[PDB]
Amino acid sequence: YDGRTGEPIEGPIVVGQMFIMKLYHMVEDKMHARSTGPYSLITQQPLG
Amino acid sequence: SDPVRQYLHEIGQVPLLTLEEEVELARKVEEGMEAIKKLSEITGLDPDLIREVVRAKILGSARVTLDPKTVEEIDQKLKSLPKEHKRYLHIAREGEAARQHLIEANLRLVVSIAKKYTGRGLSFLDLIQEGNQGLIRAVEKFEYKRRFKFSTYATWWIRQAINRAIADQARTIRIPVHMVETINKLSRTARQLQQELGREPTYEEIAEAMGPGWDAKRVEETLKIAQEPVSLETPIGDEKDSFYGDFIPDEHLPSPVDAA
Numbered sequence A: 001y002d003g004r005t006g007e008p009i010e011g012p013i014v015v016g017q018m019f020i021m022k023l024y025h026m027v028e029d030k031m032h033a034r035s036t037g038p039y040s041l042i043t044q045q046p047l048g
Numbered sequence B: 001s002d003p004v005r006q007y008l009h010e011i012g013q014v015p016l017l018t019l020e021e022e023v024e025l026a027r028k029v030e031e032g033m034e035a036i037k038k039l040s041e042i043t044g045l046d047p048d049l050i051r052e053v054v055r056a057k058i059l060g061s062a063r064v065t066l067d068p069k070t071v072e073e074i075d076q077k078l079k080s081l082p083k084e085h086k087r088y089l090h091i092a093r094e095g096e097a098a099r100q101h102l103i104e105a106n107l108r109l110v111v112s113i114a115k116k117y118t119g120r121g122l123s124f125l126d127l128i129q130e131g132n133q134g135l136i137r138a139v140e141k142f143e144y145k146r147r148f149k150f151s152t153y154a155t156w157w158i159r160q161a162i163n164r165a166i167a168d169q170a171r172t173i174r175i176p177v178h179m180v181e182t183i184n185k186l187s188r189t190a191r192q193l194q195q196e197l198g199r200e201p202t203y204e205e206i207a208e209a210m211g212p213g214w215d216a217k218r219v220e221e222t223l224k225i226a227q228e229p230v231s232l233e234t235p236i237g238d239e240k241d242s243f244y245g246d247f248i249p250d251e252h253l254p255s256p257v258d259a260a
Helices: B001-012 B021-043 B047-059 B066-079 B085-114 B124-140 B150-169 B177-197 B203-210 B217-226
Strands: none
Touching: B001 B085, B001 B124, B021 B085, B047 B066, B047 B085, B066 B150, B085 B124, B085 B150, B124 B150, B150 B177, B177 B203, B177 B217, B203 B217
């Protein structure tokens, strides 16, 4: 059954238990932004 | 290629000497030295000047501070000696030739001494050249009257020159000679203390073993001053794409936020 309407999905649906793991690639550790910051010594370009 | 083999070939192309030939060469250089001092006192000119001009003439025009006209005019000025004085010139020239021949013959002793100083911050050829300088000095100050072998007196000068070169050229940031030998003695004491204790000594043990006037702060300061800088091009990570300088920011130029 669809939770938004209460009407059934028009066809039978495969349903069952699955083993699922969380991977260490998390958005918390990857989101990054910069306006201005430190620069390199020689090229005077932004650091990485 | 392989310049060490080329230098070894050139050095082996000159044959060795026997005791008789060695003493003959040393006697000739000694008499040449006596001749140049005799000439200098006779004419009243600086012995260094006349020695340089005489050796310049012995070498030839191939060896270009003294204009050619100057040295030639001095050479003609020494052609005004009546007799018993041109003998001084001839003895001096033969002595200079003896000096050259002896140095060429005994450069192999320099090689033999320097081959056991590798792996201390200087390449083998640099060690060989500094040993050659030391050998020239030893030839300059050798006295053959004592019947001692040439190598006995030459070895000390060669080793002194080599050790001075290690002390003076091994580090990108120059450290004076006394501090260098202090650091070497500190390291030797540390290794003996490690051998005896069975572990890395603490600063207290090293200070105690140094003697009076040495405490832990002093050994710590010495060890801090003895650190050599690392390269800005040191590879960081497994892949060949990151250098050390990629992690070093500039703190001198003002930031855009600071400038406003």
